[PDB]
Structures are given as C-alpha cells and as structure tokens.
Design a protein around this nucleic acid. Structure first.
Length: 54
RNA sequence: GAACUCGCUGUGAAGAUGCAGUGUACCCGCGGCAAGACGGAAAGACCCCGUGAACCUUUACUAUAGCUUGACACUGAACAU
C-alpha cells in the first residue's frame, strides 16, 4: 500500500516514495525486514521532516 | 349381570336353558367323559377404513452433510512467451 521505502530495493524504489503496491509485498518484506516503514499517517509527517532537514 | 340353570319342533339380530306349542323329569351329592352354554385366555394379528404412525427404497418432490468447479480474501515480487 502507501508504504515508504528506505533502501536500494528494485524498480519501485527511489530511496523513498509513496507507491501503490499490494499488501502482500508490504507486510513481512517491507513491514519489518528493514528497508521501509508503514505509512499510518504518522510516518508521512515524521519522515517528511527527515527529507527536508537532511 | 342375575338364575328356582330339561329335551324337541317352529319363531327370532337369520344356530334358543329362558319365546310359543309340546314332551319328559322325586329332591341332593360324588366319581367320570368334553357335546353345548357362539366356554375362559388376548378392544383379531387376517381384511377394509383413518386425508393414522413408523421405518426402508428409488432416474418421486424439495432440502442438506460430504465430494467437485470457479471467483475474491489469506497471497508476493521480478519478468518473458
């Protein structure tokens, strides 16, 4: 779903963009194995500050 | 059910110990034999009814467990023909 990436994962990733992917690829691979974070409307404002400040 | 509980012919819910006619018979036991009293025993089991019941059977009706087909969800990413 609306998950935001953090890693060099293959061609849907650009070090973090909101994509439209299925929920099966969301959980257990992106929801924690690393490499991403769920977007439960709290991380879309927290990691947005990580984009601007860094 | 009660009886002081005879046989005939005929009558009769159509096979009479009780009716009618008639015949016969002292009163009362006991030992016997089963002919009858449509004997006793079982609201006939056979048969037919009841818009009875019960099971069982099937290409009766309508359901359903299970089996089976497909879709969605659990369930993904890359691709290619």
């Amino acid at each position: 779903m609306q998950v935001i990436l953090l890693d060099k994962v293959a061609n849907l990733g650009s070090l973090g963009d909101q994509v439209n992917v299925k929920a099966g690829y969301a959980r257990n691979f992106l929801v924690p194995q690393g490499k991403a974070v769920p977007a439960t409307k709290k991380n879309i404002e927290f990691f947005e500050a990580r984009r601007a400040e860094l």
